[PDB]
Amino acid sequence: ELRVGLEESELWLRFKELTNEMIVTKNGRRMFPVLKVNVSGLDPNAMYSFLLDFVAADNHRWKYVNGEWVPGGKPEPQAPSCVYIHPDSPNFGAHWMKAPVSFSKVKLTNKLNGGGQIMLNSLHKYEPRIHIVRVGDPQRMITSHCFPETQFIAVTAYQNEEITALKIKYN
Numbered sequence: 001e002l003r004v005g006l007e008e009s010e011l012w013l014r015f016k017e018l019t020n021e022m023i024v025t026k027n028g029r030r031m032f033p034v035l036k037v038n039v040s041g042l043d044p045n046a047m048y049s050f051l052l053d054f055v056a057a058d059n060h061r062w063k064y065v066n067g068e069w070v071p072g073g074k075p076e077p078q079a080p081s082c083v084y085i086h087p088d089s090p091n092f093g094a095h096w097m098k099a100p101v102s103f104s105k106v107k108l109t110n111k112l113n114g115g116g117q118i119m120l121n122s123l124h125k126y127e128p129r130i131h132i133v134r135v136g137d138p139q140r141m142i143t144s145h146c147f148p149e150t151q152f153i154a155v156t157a158y159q160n161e162e163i164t165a166l167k168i169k170y171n
């Protein structure tokens with residue numbers, strides 16, 4: 001059976017319990033923690049691409065008020081469809097399964113300034129989603145897994161000083 005497991009789940013959960021935040025910048029900022037997954041049950045002989053996108057979690061935005069994240073207003077119009085292609089793509093099932101797949105180079109941005117960056121709206125919550133695309137498939141089969149442990153609020157600056165300290169402690 002195809003199984004995609006989150007790596008370092010106990011690290012993501014220490015961010016999630018505070019409410020996780022990721023910085024967005026004009027030029028784009030790498031994530032911490034990095035999304036990494038283990039994969040089993042692909043065809044080792046087949047070729048696949050790995051794609052990453054970010055699904056908007058809410059019909060509203062968030063605000064950090066008195067040390068608490070609370071509903072913060074109506075949402076901005078949805079960020080454009082941005083998909084990140086894992087740079088090892090396309091590659092054999094055996095390649096994806098032999099070691100964890102790490103999205104270490106994806107950059108989150110608040111400006112369409114090119115460079116394969118993912119545009120997100122500040123003070124909106126997102127959930128990472130990985131797609132596995134089979135190459136040369138006339139049915140264009142895709143699989144999609146969501147990672148609820150990895151939800152975060154996009155910010156231009158950290159709101160929670162405990163997040164600022166955790167990012168420094170573990171990174």
Ligand SMILES: CN(Cc1cccc(F)c1)S(N)(=O)=O
Nearest residue numbers: 001002003041042142143144
């Ligand atoms: C994708 N699903 C079916 C499946 C995945 C992999 C191998 C299988 F033999 C069956 S799912 N989301 O569990 O319905």
Ligand SMILES: CN(Cc1cccc(F)c1)S(N)(=O)=O
Nearest residue numbers: 007008009010011012014170
């Ligand atoms: C031992 N912990 C920290 C950790 C740091 C960096 C990467 C990790 F996979 C785990 S933990 N799981 O929070 O207890």
